[PDB]
Design a protein around this nucleic acid. Structure first.
Ligand SMILES: [Mn+2]
Ligand SMILES: [Mn+2]
Ligand code: NA
Ligand code: NA
Ligand code: NA
Length: 316
DNA sequence: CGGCAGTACTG
DNA sequence: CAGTACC
DNA sequence: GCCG
């Protein structure tokens, strides 16, 4: 990164915009920040600024002020509330709206929130694991977690396939959570197993808390046996074999890579979701189309006219 | 001017 | 529904 | 915030 002396200061505004709710401006900043990391050279000019895709006028001027100032003006006028809003929004299940309300009501610290704030079932679980959910795990621990789920699932029907996705499948050394995907070749044996599997994982204490118990998506908390173990976020998604490849790619990410893929699909009258790549094409103000067969991840890249990127290179 | 994704819970 | 979360 |  040739521009850490520029990105460091923009990351402060970005996070300030996101916690304050300005989600589009925050996105715009984020793009620009990743662009300058991607760049090969230090930015040297206002026109070298506008040259980058993702850097426009307004942020060209800010890099311009920084490149002489050595520091930016706007940073001195950040509202005093940003650090508190960030602290609150880092509770799982609490977003920008809940944090700003808590701030309006005078809350200023997690002791205040524990003391006086009403919390949803999800937020109380998030607060209780506030530190654990902020730290990443070694990828080897992600492997035990996948294997724990896999042996539980394969006991019922051994035809079942189980794959950890997310940053783990992208080959990163540490993982924020574990995203386990499940399907069955016979195309029907995948259905109605959350009953038995989550009961089995809950049997000897692997599952500790449930955040979301949908019919296809489970989000929750797990912990491995023995000393030194922290509580880890675990998600489980069960899909029809038809949608295996598309789910495989969505839940491996990354989120910016998924977003770029969706954008290119839109250039070609197609739509990409976790369920399917579709020729749903009508776009003139904003009637779906046809799901195209994608037995493998390769097919999605292919029908989109891209060369196959293996998971490790989608870590955008 | 207006999209930047869609989908699934929760209450 | 608004809010939040998943990548 | 950017960009068409
Ligand atoms: Mn993940
Ligand atoms: Mn813990
Ligand atoms: Na540009
Ligand atoms: Na949160
Ligand atoms: Na996850």
């Amino acid at each position: 990164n040739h521009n850490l002396h520029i990105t460091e200061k923009l990351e402060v505004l970005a996070k300030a915009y996101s916690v304050q709710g300005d989600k589009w401006r925050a996105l715009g900043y984020a793009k620009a920040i990743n662009a300058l990391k991607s760049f090969h050279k230090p930015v040297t000019s206002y026109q070298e600024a506008c040259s980058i895709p993702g850097i426009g006028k307004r942020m060209a001027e800010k890099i311009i002020e920084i490149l002489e100032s050595g520091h930016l003006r706007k940073l001195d006028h950040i509202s005093e509330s940003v650090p508190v809003l960030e602290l609150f929004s880092n509770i799982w299940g609490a977003g920008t709206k809940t944090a700003q309300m808590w701030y309006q009501q005078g809350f200023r610290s997690l002791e205040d929130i524990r003391s006086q704030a009403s919390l949803t079932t999800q937020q109380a679980i998030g607060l209780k694991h506030y530190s654990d959910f902020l730290e990443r795990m070694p990828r080897e621990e992600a492997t035990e977690i996948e294997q724990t789920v896999q042996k539980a699932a394969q006991a019922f029907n051994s035809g079942l396939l189980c794959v950890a996705c997310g940053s783990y499948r992208r080959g990163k050394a540490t993982c924020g959570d574990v995203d386990v995907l499940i399907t069955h070749p016979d195309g029907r044996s995948h259905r109605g197993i959350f009953s038995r599997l989550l009961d089995s994982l809950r049997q000897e204490g692997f599952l500790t808390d449930d955040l979301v118990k949908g019919e296809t998506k489970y989000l929750g908390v797990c912990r491995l046996p023995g000393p030194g173990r922290r509580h880890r976020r675990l998600d489980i998604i069960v899909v029809p074999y038809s949608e295996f490849a598309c789910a495989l790619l969505y839940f491996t990410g990354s989120a910016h890579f998924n977003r770029s893929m969706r954008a290119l699909a839109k250039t070609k009258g197609m739509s990409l979701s976790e369920h399917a790549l579709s020729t749903a094409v009508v776009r003139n103000t904003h009637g779906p189309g046809r799901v195209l067969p994608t037995p493998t991840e390769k097919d999605v890249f292919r029908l989109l006219g891209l060369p196959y990127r293996e998971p490790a290179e989608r870590d955008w």
